[PDB]
Amino acid sequence: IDAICSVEGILLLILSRQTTIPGYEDELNKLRTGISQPKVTERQYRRA
């Protein structure tokens, strides 16, 4: 169950712009500059 929880978490990290981590907060604005929120939806979420 920890494995599935960690999977869901890490996936939650690269989507859903409304969450950061206590620190860098900028290389996230380097990473997630490829997803182009909000064109992302289910079909895409499940593929991820």
Binding site: T33, S36, K39
Partner: protein
Amino acid sequence: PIYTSGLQKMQSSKVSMANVVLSAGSDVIRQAAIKYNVVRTQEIILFE
């Protein structure tokens, strides 16, 4: 066609024979042609 100096050859209601006629030449029916170039600026979807 007007007269020599009379009013007009369509007022006297009297027929005339020898008035003057325009003529064209061999080929005055050349159809016309135009062309356009199209290129669009902003696509519909976009952005990495």
